[PDB]
Amino acid sequence: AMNERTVAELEKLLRYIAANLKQRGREILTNYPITPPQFVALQWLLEEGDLTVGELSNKMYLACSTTTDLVDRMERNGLVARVRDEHVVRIRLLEKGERIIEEVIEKRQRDLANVLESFSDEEIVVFERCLRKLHQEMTK
Protein backbone atom coordinates (compact mmCIF):
# COMPACT_ATOMS: atom_id res chain seq x y z
CA ALA A 1 0.00 0.00 0.00
CA MET A 2 3.16 2.10 -0.25
CA ASN A 3 3.72 4.58 -3.02
CA GLU A 4 6.70 3.63 -5.19
CA ARG A 5 7.40 7.07 -6.71
CA THR A 6 7.73 8.48 -3.17
CA VAL A 7 9.71 5.55 -1.76
CA ALA A 8 12.07 5.85 -4.77
CA GLU A 9 12.54 9.58 -3.98
CA LEU A 10 13.18 8.87 -0.35
CA GLU A 11 15.64 6.09 -1.06
CA LYS A 12 17.66 8.39 -3.38
CA LEU A 13 17.56 11.30 -0.84
CA LEU A 14 18.76 9.14 2.05
CA ARG A 15 21.56 7.75 -0.11
CA TYR A 16 22.76 11.18 -1.34
CA ILE A 17 22.40 12.61 2.20
CA ALA A 18 24.54 9.77 3.62
CA ALA A 19 27.10 10.21 0.83
CA ASN A 20 27.40 13.93 1.58
CA LEU A 21 27.64 13.34 5.37
CA LYS A 22 30.36 10.74 4.82
CA GLN A 23 32.47 13.22 2.86
CA ARG A 24 31.92 16.07 5.41
CA GLY A 25 33.12 13.52 8.02
CA ARG A 26 36.22 12.78 5.89
CA GLU A 27 37.07 16.43 5.43
CA ILE A 28 36.76 17.07 9.17
CA LEU A 29 39.05 14.14 9.98
CA THR A 30 41.84 15.46 7.78
CA ASN A 31 42.75 17.73 10.72
CA TYR A 32 42.95 14.86 13.26
CA PRO A 33 45.47 12.08 13.76
CA ILE A 34 42.81 9.31 13.53
CA THR A 35 41.27 7.49 10.60
CA PRO A 36 37.52 6.99 9.89
CA PRO A 37 37.27 3.47 11.46
CA GLN A 38 39.21 4.74 14.51
CA PHE A 39 36.63 7.55 14.78
CA VAL A 40 33.81 4.92 14.75
CA ALA A 41 35.63 2.70 17.29
CA LEU A 42 36.38 5.64 19.65
CA GLN A 43 32.87 7.06 19.44
CA TRP A 44 31.47 3.59 20.44
CA LEU A 45 33.75 3.52 23.48
CA LEU A 46 32.77 7.09 24.40
CA GLU A 47 29.07 6.27 24.04
CA GLU A 48 29.07 2.75 25.57
CA GLY A 49 32.07 2.63 27.97
CA ASP A 50 34.59 -0.27 28.06
CA LEU A 51 33.88 -2.87 25.30
CA THR A 52 35.39 -6.24 24.53
CA VAL A 53 36.70 -6.70 20.97
CA GLY A 54 33.75 -9.01 20.41
CA GLU A 55 31.31 -6.31 21.54
CA LEU A 56 33.07 -3.63 19.56
CA SER A 57 33.16 -5.69 16.40
CA ASN A 58 29.40 -6.47 16.70
CA LYS A 59 28.73 -2.71 16.94
CA MET A 60 30.83 -1.96 13.88
CA TYR A 61 29.72 -4.97 11.86
CA LEU A 62 33.34 -6.16 11.42
CA ALA A 63 35.01 -9.57 11.77
CA CYS A 64 37.01 -10.09 14.95
CA SER A 65 40.36 -10.17 13.05
CA THR A 66 39.66 -6.70 11.57
CA THR A 67 38.58 -5.26 14.89
CA THR A 68 41.68 -6.64 16.66
CA ASP A 69 44.07 -5.02 14.13
CA LEU A 70 42.22 -1.72 14.62
CA VAL A 71 42.33 -1.94 18.41
CA ASP A 72 46.04 -2.92 18.14
CA ARG A 73 46.80 0.31 16.09
CA MET A 74 44.89 2.50 18.54
CA GLU A 75 46.51 0.91 21.56
CA ARG A 76 49.97 1.39 19.96
CA ASN A 77 49.13 5.13 19.45
CA GLY A 78 47.89 5.53 23.05
CA LEU A 79 44.21 6.17 22.18
CA VAL A 80 42.93 3.10 24.08
CA ALA A 81 44.18 0.55 26.61
CA ARG A 82 43.27 -3.10 27.13
CA VAL A 83 41.92 -3.76 30.63
CA ARG A 84 41.09 -7.15 32.08
CA ASP A 85 38.42 -7.78 34.69
CA GLU A 86 39.49 -8.11 38.30
CA HIS A 87 36.65 -10.68 38.60
CA VAL A 88 37.88 -11.15 29.82
CA VAL A 89 39.74 -8.11 28.41
CA ARG A 90 37.97 -4.85 27.51
CA ILE A 91 39.04 -1.86 25.46
CA ARG A 92 39.03 1.38 27.42
CA LEU A 93 39.12 4.88 26.01
CA LEU A 94 42.24 6.70 27.19
CA GLU A 95 42.28 10.49 27.79
CA LYS A 96 44.24 11.05 24.57
CA GLY A 97 41.61 9.18 22.54
CA GLU A 98 38.67 10.87 24.29
CA ARG A 99 40.14 14.35 23.83
CA ILE A 100 40.37 13.83 20.03
CA ILE A 101 36.89 12.40 19.48
CA GLU A 102 35.16 14.98 21.59
CA GLU A 103 36.89 17.51 19.38
CA VAL A 104 35.83 15.77 16.15
CA ILE A 105 32.23 15.53 17.35
CA GLU A 106 32.17 19.23 18.30
CA LYS A 107 33.44 20.14 14.83
CA ARG A 108 30.70 17.84 13.34
CA GLN A 109 28.15 19.70 15.45
CA ARG A 110 29.40 23.13 14.32
CA ASP A 111 29.37 21.92 10.69
CA LEU A 112 25.75 20.79 11.02
CA ALA A 113 24.72 23.99 12.81
CA ASN A 114 25.91 25.77 9.58
CA VAL A 115 23.86 23.48 7.33
CA LEU A 116 20.80 24.00 9.56
CA GLU A 117 20.94 27.79 9.86
CA SER A 118 18.27 28.26 7.22
CA PHE A 119 15.78 25.94 8.95
CA SER A 120 13.24 27.83 11.07
CA ASP A 121 12.63 26.93 14.76
CA GLU A 122 9.57 24.92 13.66
CA GLU A 123 11.34 23.03 10.86
CA ILE A 124 14.16 22.01 13.22
CA VAL A 125 11.77 20.58 15.76
CA VAL A 126 9.76 18.64 13.06
CA PHE A 127 12.97 17.52 11.41
CA GLU A 128 14.27 16.08 14.71
CA ARG A 129 10.97 14.38 15.29
CA CYS A 130 11.26 12.71 11.79
CA LEU A 131 14.82 11.55 12.35
CA ARG A 132 13.97 10.21 15.78
CA LYS A 133 11.08 8.12 14.26
CA LEU A 134 13.26 7.04 11.32
CA HIS A 135 16.09 5.94 13.65
CA GLN A 136 13.72 4.11 15.95
CA GLU A 137 12.00 2.19 13.10
CA MET A 138 15.39 1.30 11.55
CA THR A 139 16.74 -0.17 14.78
CA LYS A 140 13.65 -2.38 15.22
Next chain:
Amino acid sequence: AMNERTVAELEKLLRYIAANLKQRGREILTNYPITPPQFVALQWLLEEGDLTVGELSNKMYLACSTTTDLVDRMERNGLVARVRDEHVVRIRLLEKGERIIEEVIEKRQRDLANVLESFSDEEIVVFERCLRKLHQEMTK
Protein backbone atom coordinates in the same frame (compact mmCIF):
# COMPACT_ATOMS: atom_id res chain seq x y z
CA ALA B 1 21.72 31.67 17.86
CA MET B 2 21.54 27.89 17.45
CA ASN B 3 20.65 25.60 20.30
CA GLU B 4 23.53 23.26 21.18
CA ARG B 5 21.51 20.56 22.98
CA THR B 6 19.36 20.17 19.84
CA VAL B 7 22.25 20.38 17.37
CA ALA B 8 24.08 17.72 19.45
CA GLU B 9 20.96 15.47 19.24
CA LEU B 10 20.67 15.99 15.54
CA GLU B 11 24.34 15.32 14.89
CA LYS B 12 24.14 12.01 16.82
CA LEU B 13 20.87 10.99 15.01
CA LEU B 14 22.28 11.68 11.56
CA ARG B 15 25.43 9.73 12.40
CA TYR B 16 23.56 6.68 13.78
CA ILE B 17 21.07 6.85 10.86
CA ALA B 18 23.95 6.87 8.34
CA ALA B 19 25.69 4.02 10.19
CA ASN B 20 22.52 1.90 10.07
CA LEU B 21 21.89 2.71 6.36
CA LYS B 22 25.48 1.77 5.53
CA GLN B 23 25.05 -1.65 7.11
CA ARG B 24 21.63 -2.27 5.44
CA GLY B 25 23.44 -1.42 2.16
CA ARG B 26 26.19 -3.96 3.00
CA GLU B 27 23.73 -6.70 3.82
CA ILE B 28 21.84 -6.11 0.57
CA LEU B 29 25.07 -6.28 -1.46
CA THR B 30 25.98 -9.68 -0.08
CA ASN B 31 23.60 -11.12 -2.69
CA TYR B 32 25.23 -9.28 -5.63
CA PRO B 33 28.54 -9.77 -7.42
CA ILE B 34 29.65 -6.13 -6.85
CA THR B 35 31.38 -4.41 -3.95
CA PRO B 36 30.27 -1.19 -2.18
CA PRO B 37 32.54 1.19 -4.20
CA GLN B 38 31.41 -0.53 -7.42
CA PHE B 39 27.81 0.13 -6.33
CA VAL B 40 28.67 3.86 -5.88
CA ALA B 41 30.53 4.01 -9.22
CA LEU B 42 27.70 2.24 -11.12
CA GLN B 43 24.95 4.33 -9.54
CA TRP B 44 26.84 7.54 -10.64
CA LEU B 45 26.98 6.25 -14.22
CA LEU B 46 23.29 5.30 -14.10
CA GLU B 47 22.35 8.72 -12.72
CA GLU B 48 24.76 10.89 -14.79
CA GLY B 49 25.48 8.92 -18.00
CA ASP B 50 29.01 8.43 -19.43
CA LEU B 51 31.71 9.90 -17.10
CA THR B 52 35.44 10.34 -17.48
CA VAL B 53 37.58 8.85 -14.69
CA GLY B 54 38.29 12.42 -13.64
CA GLU B 55 34.56 13.19 -13.41
CA LEU B 56 33.82 9.94 -11.65
CA SER B 57 36.57 10.40 -9.11
CA ASN B 58 35.37 13.97 -8.32
CA LYS B 59 31.88 12.54 -7.65
CA MET B 60 33.23 9.85 -5.35
CA TYR B 61 35.85 12.02 -3.66
CA LEU B 62 38.66 9.60 -4.63
CA ALA B 63 42.13 10.12 -6.11
CA CYS B 64 42.47 9.33 -9.81
CA SER B 65 44.71 6.28 -9.15
CA THR B 66 42.00 4.72 -6.91
CA THR B 67 39.24 5.43 -9.38
CA THR B 68 41.24 3.94 -12.28
CA ASP B 69 41.85 0.64 -10.42
CA LEU B 70 38.11 0.48 -9.67
CA VAL B 71 37.12 1.20 -13.27
CA ASP B 72 39.74 -1.38 -14.39
CA ARG B 73 38.10 -4.11 -12.15
CA MET B 74 34.61 -3.28 -13.41
CA GLU B 75 35.70 -3.20 -17.02
CA ARG B 76 37.43 -6.61 -16.57
CA ASN B 77 34.13 -8.02 -15.14
CA GLY B 78 32.06 -6.55 -18.01
CA LEU B 79 30.09 -4.03 -15.90
CA VAL B 80 31.41 -0.97 -17.81
CA ALA B 81 33.28 -0.18 -21.03
CA ARG B 82 35.69 2.63 -21.88
CA VAL B 83 34.48 4.73 -24.81
CA ARG B 84 36.41 7.49 -26.51
CA ASP B 85 34.84 10.51 -28.19
CA GLU B 86 34.45 10.46 -31.94
CA HIS B 87 35.14 14.23 -31.77
CA VAL B 88 38.94 11.88 -24.10
CA VAL B 89 37.76 8.46 -22.83
CA ARG B 90 34.54 8.00 -20.84
CA ILE B 91 33.23 5.14 -18.73
CA ARG B 92 29.93 3.76 -19.97
CA LEU B 93 27.55 1.55 -18.05
CA LEU B 94 27.13 -1.78 -19.83
CA GLU B 95 23.83 -3.74 -19.71
CA LYS B 96 25.32 -6.24 -17.24
CA GLY B 97 26.29 -3.44 -14.85
CA GLU B 98 22.96 -1.62 -15.22
CA ARG B 99 20.93 -4.77 -14.64
CA ILE B 100 22.69 -5.38 -11.28
CA ILE B 101 22.42 -1.84 -9.90
CA GLU B 102 18.81 -1.42 -10.83
CA GLU B 103 18.24 -4.60 -8.89
CA VAL B 104 20.23 -3.38 -5.85
CA ILE B 105 18.36 -0.07 -5.85
CA GLU B 106 14.98 -1.84 -6.05
CA LYS B 107 15.94 -4.00 -3.06
CA ARG B 108 17.04 -0.78 -1.22
CA GLN B 109 13.64 0.71 -2.01
CA ARG B 110 11.76 -2.38 -0.74
CA ASP B 111 13.92 -2.36 2.42
CA LEU B 112 13.05 1.29 3.07
CA ALA B 113 9.36 0.75 2.33
CA ASN B 114 9.49 -1.78 5.27
CA VAL B 115 11.14 0.73 7.61
CA LEU B 116 8.57 3.37 6.61
CA GLU B 117 5.42 1.27 6.97
CA SER B 118 4.64 2.75 10.38
CA PHE B 119 4.83 6.35 9.15
CA SER B 120 1.40 7.82 8.34
CA ASP B 121 0.67 9.47 4.95
CA GLU B 122 1.25 12.87 6.60
CA GLU B 123 4.54 11.92 8.29
CA ILE B 124 5.92 10.58 4.99
CA VAL B 125 5.17 13.78 3.15
CA VAL B 126 6.70 15.98 5.95
CA PHE B 127 9.65 13.65 6.25
CA GLU B 128 10.38 13.94 2.50
CA ARG B 129 10.06 17.68 2.72
CA CYS B 130 12.69 17.70 5.58
CA LEU B 131 15.13 15.50 3.69
CA ARG B 132 14.74 17.54 0.53
CA LYS B 133 15.59 20.77 2.50
CA LEU B 134 18.45 19.02 4.34
CA HIS B 135 19.92 17.71 1.06
CA GLN B 136 19.58 21.06 -0.64
CA GLU B 137 21.28 22.99 2.21
CA MET B 138 24.10 20.40 2.40
CA THR B 139 24.89 20.66 -1.31
CA LYS B 140 25.13 24.47 -1.12
